Design a protein around this nucleic acid. Structure first.
Ligand SMILES: [Mg+2]
Ligand SMILES: [Mg+2]
Ligand SMILES: [Mg+2]
Ligand SMILES: [Mg+2]
Ligand SMILES: [Mg+2]
Ligand SMILES: [Mg+2]
Ligand SMILES: [Mg+2]
Ligand SMILES: [Mg+2]
Ligand SMILES: [Mg+2]
Ligand SMILES: [Mg+2]
Ligand SMILES: [Mg+2]
Ligand SMILES: [Mg+2]
Ligand SMILES: [Mg+2]
Ligand SMILES: [Mg+2]
Ligand SMILES: [Mg+2]
Ligand SMILES: [Mg+2]
Ligand SMILES: [Mg+2]
Ligand SMILES: [Mg+2]
Ligand SMILES: [Mg+2]
Ligand SMILES: [Mg+2]
Ligand SMILES: [Mg+2]
Ligand SMILES: [Mg+2]
Ligand SMILES: [Mg+2]
Ligand SMILES: [Mg+2]
Ligand SMILES: [Mg+2]
Ligand SMILES: [Mg+2]
Ligand SMILES: [Mg+2]
Ligand SMILES: [Mg+2]
Ligand SMILES: [Mg+2]
Ligand SMILES: [Mg+2]
Ligand SMILES: [Mg+2]
Ligand SMILES: [Mg+2]
Ligand SMILES: [Mg+2]
Ligand SMILES: [Mg+2]
Ligand SMILES: [Mg+2]
Ligand SMILES: [Mg+2]
Ligand SMILES: [Mg+2]
Ligand SMILES: [Mg+2]
Ligand SMILES: [Mg+2]
Ligand SMILES: [Mg+2]
Ligand SMILES: [Mg+2]
Ligand SMILES: [Mg+2]
Ligand SMILES: [Mg+2]
Ligand SMILES: [Mg+2]
Ligand SMILES: [Mg+2]
Ligand SMILES: [Mg+2]
Ligand SMILES: [Mg+2]
Ligand SMILES: [Mg+2]
Ligand SMILES: [Mg+2]
Ligand SMILES: [Mg+2]
Ligand SMILES: [Mg+2]
Ligand SMILES: [Mg+2]
Ligand SMILES: [Mg+2]
Lengths: 172, 106, 49, 127, 197
RNA sequence: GAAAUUGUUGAAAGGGAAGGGCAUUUGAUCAGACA
RNA sequence: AGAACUGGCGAUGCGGGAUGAACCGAACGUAGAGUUAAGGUGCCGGAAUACACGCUCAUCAGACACCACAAAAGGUGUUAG
RNA sequence: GCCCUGAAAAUGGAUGGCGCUCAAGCGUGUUACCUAUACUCUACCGUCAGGGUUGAUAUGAUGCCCUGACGAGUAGGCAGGCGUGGAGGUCAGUGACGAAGCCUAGACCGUAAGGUCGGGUCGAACGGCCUCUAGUGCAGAUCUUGGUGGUAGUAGCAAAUA
RNA sequence: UUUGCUCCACACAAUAUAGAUGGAUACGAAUAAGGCGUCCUUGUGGCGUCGCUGAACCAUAGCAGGCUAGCAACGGUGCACUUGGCGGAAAGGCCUUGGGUGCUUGCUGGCGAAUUGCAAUGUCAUUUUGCGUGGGGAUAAAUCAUUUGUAUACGACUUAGA
């Protein structure tokens, strides 16, 4: 659904006489702007509490920035989704440099592999896998062998003009 | 010397148009060596001449010219729209055209 | 509706058009495969019926 | 020699010819409105002839001005012609079609004297 | 850019060569395409063969003469892909098409005139490596074209003469380089360096 | 002494109809305005 | 075939859906300049053979609402769970 | 999930066509770009509204001036107009030095009905303006009467012995 | 049929033009591989180097390019000759010899340019044809009518006729 930021959103049920100071619940929400983010918040609260937005208020909204945006990280990702004939839990591992980047490729992947649009997914948890060897999916492990190296065979230069006078070479 | 060219080579391509409706009042011009709208911004305002020939001599010549100006860029690949004194004939879609260097700003 | 009884078409579609030839002298559309080992000779001959 | 005026704009020079007036002789080009129920013209489908309608109306300023800037006024004799004696920057005389040859030279003469423009001096001219 | 552009068909993808050729024509660029027998179509040989027989069945039921025409030649296959991308029943379209010439092999004029390529339709630059594809020459012969052998023969002949031409030239520019060499390290030379030459 | 329709002459266009709309090239033709 | 509420077509062109009464967009005096809708931008055709991550190879692949159809059931094809 | 089997109809044939395979395919994301009689600004037409202006000594008070907004349309309603035959009035209107009519990819006015002029033909009458009046406007009605085509130099003009 | 035809030459007239305006600048083959240089044991060889676009290469100064002088080179190039050879895929074009002649911006000189008035394509290309001029060259046939019947509805076909 876009290029994500991650938000803390904090909300509560409106105060009353016999209950001032209602409890205060927070969610981390991945969305592209704060309007989508406050909406997602109410979406999920109404799956957990007796509230709706008409009887609650957003207390705070705050964008959370990646702590080490240029440290490569192995993410564990947990997702719930809906298929055409049923709904299902999944665990994926993603390797990127920020939760935000991680979540963007997830939704991409879910769309491409499973045909899940944004409406049909629930991020249940996104967490940095600290020690390797608790990294579980091979398509990632592959990339943490010692002294890793690889070529990119069959190089494809982009032409800038419609006619060439050479005959390209895919060397690299 | 051998070259005397003081203009940029160019080509009459289309009228401004829809899928199914054209508008003779605006002509579309591809300019040699202009690949992008940024490149094409240079030529905005430059003057175009479509130079053609005829059998009847007129003011002592068998050569005639339809004059116009470049007015804005067009799309992403350095094509340009232009208007003329009189709309270009349309047998000329694919005919050559001359983009001068005046009015100059360098 | 469908014939009723099946019967083979009349005449051969490989001899169309059934127009008059472009000349009395029918053309030799094809000559024998050449075998350059043998002596030179004609491969056809003109006559009258 | 005519009152100065803003550039005359005509909006629709092309004649509004009746539909199919090109298609059967029996149909004159004179404008006539389609009233048929199915008619492409009346329904105004892309591609067919325009119909006359009030947007085409000319600038109140330049209306009735012919190219020179004068309105034309039909003239049958000197007396008619003299109704324009204080209006030569603004109206121009046209000599009526049924005015005689000899009677045009009188009119043509007086018009010259009064500085009145004449739209068709060459008529019936004894050349 | 140049008055006539000669494209070496070999290793190009039919419909992508077609799409750019049609365009150049429409903009007034004369084009001649050569070695159309060495053209490619993606998809393995059988598929395109099947596709072609699909083409073959279409004909005017009352008179096969007025119905769609099936040209077997690799150049005419190619022209078909082209003509299909040009509003060819208009005068502008006819005009465009006259700017076009398509050949099997590289016949005179063009064998001594340079030919170019079109990278955005170069098979080796477009098809994922691994994917099966089809040579036009072979596709044509299987649907009737009669002259692969005699193109092959002429080409092989032509290719001999051009390797000579080449050998000579490469020998002439070894000298020419042995010139740009004395001249090196001279005043005029480093002066030209300075200005990027 | 209209029109349909016809002969001649002149000009023009015409790859399975013709005619029409917006627009310009070309040709032919013409008004006005200038002092 | 027959009812309910609204919105339309009929009575209405215009842009889109190739095509089409009813769908999408948008309702019309004569025009200039600008910006858009719905819908598009390889070529036909105005507009990126743009960018990015995946998936897909079909000896009857697939390709955009209304819409011009396909099902049960199967696969040690391949993908992710 | 994509792909494959499951998957049979009649003229040859349709993701609109060409064609496309790390797509020009399918899912999803991000920019840019094209273009409606729509939106914005401006001119001009007309409609509706709200103002202003009898003060001579010049010309429309149904006038003139300022301002705002609006404009689809069958059946149908109303309005302001164009055109014909005839009638009262008027212009002491046009005309044998050529009325009327007719012809004219010549001109000009009008959004239009139409109006005006030139040239050619012609031969005896005719028109502007205010009014009055109706047997007052045609493309259709298998409309009426007359005239004329393509069909076409075509079908044919071949029974009864010559 | 009132001196016709054809190739070369130039002169005038006309008619065009799907669109000149420095140059279409020649290996082949591979792409999970190649180009070039160099050596060698000549090979699926050693060694070097290059790419990452033609953003190149070549050409390019002079009244649209005038008139002139000189030097250094002996190089470049235009033209018309002439020598030897190559190319049939549509060769109709490529290469080579030799003298002649022009130009040379390789370098250094003398003169000229204005008024086209502050821009107006400012005209420099290549199609086809027509009329005469004189330098070469060449001096037919088909059709109607007649006729055959290997042919035929009519045309057509096929024969025959100094
Ligand atoms: Mg963090
Ligand atoms: Mg049967
Ligand atoms: Mg014959
Ligand atoms: Mg009617
Ligand atoms: Mg009807
Ligand atoms: Mg209807
Ligand atoms: Mg008579
Ligand atoms: Mg004519
Ligand atoms: Mg016109
Ligand atoms: Mg609705
Ligand atoms: Mg009804
Ligand atoms: Mg409607
Ligand atoms: Mg449409
Ligand atoms: Mg459709
Ligand atoms: Mg097409
Ligand atoms: Mg385009
Ligand atoms: Mg872009
Ligand atoms: Mg659906
Ligand atoms: Mg599966
Ligand atoms: Mg399909
Ligand atoms: Mg398409
Ligand atoms: Mg996509
Ligand atoms: Mg408008
Ligand atoms: Mg407005
Ligand atoms: Mg209305
Ligand atoms: Mg009246
Ligand atoms: Mg009357
Ligand atoms: Mg009466
Ligand atoms: Mg007429
Ligand atoms: Mg006039
Ligand atoms: Mg007269
Ligand atoms: Mg008269
Ligand atoms: Mg009489
Ligand atoms: Mg009255
Ligand atoms: Mg009546
Ligand atoms: Mg009527
Ligand atoms: Mg009638
Ligand atoms: Mg009728
Ligand atoms: Mg009627
Ligand atoms: Mg009748
Ligand atoms: Mg009759
Ligand atoms: Mg007869
Ligand atoms: Mg007969
Ligand atoms: Mg009989
Ligand atoms: Mg042309
Ligand atoms: Mg190497
Ligand atoms: Mg080597
Ligand atoms: Mg080696
Ligand atoms: Mg180079
Ligand atoms: Mg010089
Ligand atoms: Mg050729
Ligand atoms: Mg000098
Ligand atoms: Mg001669």
């Amino acid at each position: 659904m876009a290029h994500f930021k991650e938000y803390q959103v904090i909300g509560r049920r409106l105060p009353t006489e016999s209950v001032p100071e209602p409890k205060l619940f927070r969610m981390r929400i991945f969305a592209s702007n704060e309007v989508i983010a406050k909406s997602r918040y109410w979406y999920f609260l109404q799956k957990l509490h007796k509230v709706k937005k008409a009887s609650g208020e957003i207390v705070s909204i705050n964008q959370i920035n990646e702590a080490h945006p240029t440290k490569v990280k192995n993410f564990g990702v947990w997702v719930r989704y809906d298929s055409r004939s049923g709904t299902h839990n999944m665990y994926k591992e993603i390797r990127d440099v920020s939760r935000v980047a991680a979540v963007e490729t997830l939704y991409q992947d879910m769309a491409a592999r499973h045909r899940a649009r944004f409406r049909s997914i629930h991020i249940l948890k996104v967490a940095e896998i600290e020690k390797t060897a608790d990294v579980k999916r091979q398509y990632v492990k592959q990339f943490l062998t010692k002294d890793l190296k690889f070529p990119l065979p069959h190089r494809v230069q982009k032409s800038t003009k419609t006619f060439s006078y050479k005959r390209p070479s895919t060397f690299y | 010397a051998e070259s005397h060219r003081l203009y940029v080579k160019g080509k009459h391509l289309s009228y401004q148009r829809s899928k199914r409706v054209n508008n003779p009042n605006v002509s579309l011009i591809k300019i040699e060596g202009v690949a992008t709208p940024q490149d094409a911004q240079f030529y905005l305002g430059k003057r175009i001449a479509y130079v053609y020939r005829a059998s009847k001599e007129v003011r002592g010549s068998k050569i005639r010219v339809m004059w116009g100006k470049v007015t804005r860029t067009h799309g992403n690949s350095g094509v340009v729209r232009a208007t003329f004194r009189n709309n270009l004939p349309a047998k000329t879609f694919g005919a050559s055209v001359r983009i001068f260097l005046y009015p100059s700003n360098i | 509706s469908h014939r009723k009884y099946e019967a083979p078409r009349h005449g051969h579609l490989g001899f169309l058009p059934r127009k008059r030839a472009a000349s009395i002298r029918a053309r030799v559309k094809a000559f024998p495969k050449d075998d350059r080992s043998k002596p030179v000779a004609l491969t056809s001959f003109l006559g009258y019926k | 020699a005519s009152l100065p005026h803003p550039k005359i704009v005509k909006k629709h020079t092309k004649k509004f010819k009746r539909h199919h007036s090109d298609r059967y002789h029996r149909v004159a080009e004179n404008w006539r409105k389609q009233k048929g129920i199915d008619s492409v013209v009346r329904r105004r489908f892309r591609g067919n002839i325009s119909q006359p309608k009030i947007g085409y109306g000319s600038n109140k300023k330049t209306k009735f001005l012919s190219p020179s800037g004068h309105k034309t006024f039909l003239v049958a004799n000197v007396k008619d012609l003299e109704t324009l004696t204080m209006h030569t920057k603004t109206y121009a005389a046209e000599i009526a079609h049924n005015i005689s040859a000899k009677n045009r030279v009188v009119i043509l003469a007086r018009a010259k004297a009064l500085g009145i423009k004449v739209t068709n001096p060459k008529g019936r001219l004894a050349l | 850019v140049e008055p006539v552009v000669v494209i070496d068909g070999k290793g190009h993808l039919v419909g992508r060569l077609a799409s750019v050729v049609a365009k150049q024509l429409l903009n007034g660029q004369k084009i001649v395409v050569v070695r159309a027998e060495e053209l490619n179509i993606s998809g393995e040989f059988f598929r395109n063969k099947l596709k072609y027989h699909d083409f073959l069945r279409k004909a005017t039921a009352f008179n096969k003469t007025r119905g769609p025409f099936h040209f077997r030649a690799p150049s005419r296959i190619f022209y078909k892909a082209l003509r299909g991308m040009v509003s060819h029943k208009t005068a502008r379209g006819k005009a465009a098409l006259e700017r076009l010439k398509v050949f099997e092999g590289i016949p005179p004029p063009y064998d001594k005139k340079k030919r170019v390529v079109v990278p955005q339709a170069l098979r080796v630059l477009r098809l994922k490596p691994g994917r099966k594809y089809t040579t036009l020459g072979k596709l044509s012969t299987s649907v009737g074209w009669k002259y692969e052998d005699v193109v092959a023969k002429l080409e092989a002949k032509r290719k001999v003469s051009s390797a000579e031409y080449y050998a000579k030239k490469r020998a002439f520019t070894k000298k020419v380089a042995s010139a740009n060499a004395t001249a090196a390290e001279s005043d005029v030379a480093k002066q030209l360096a300075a200005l990027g030459y």
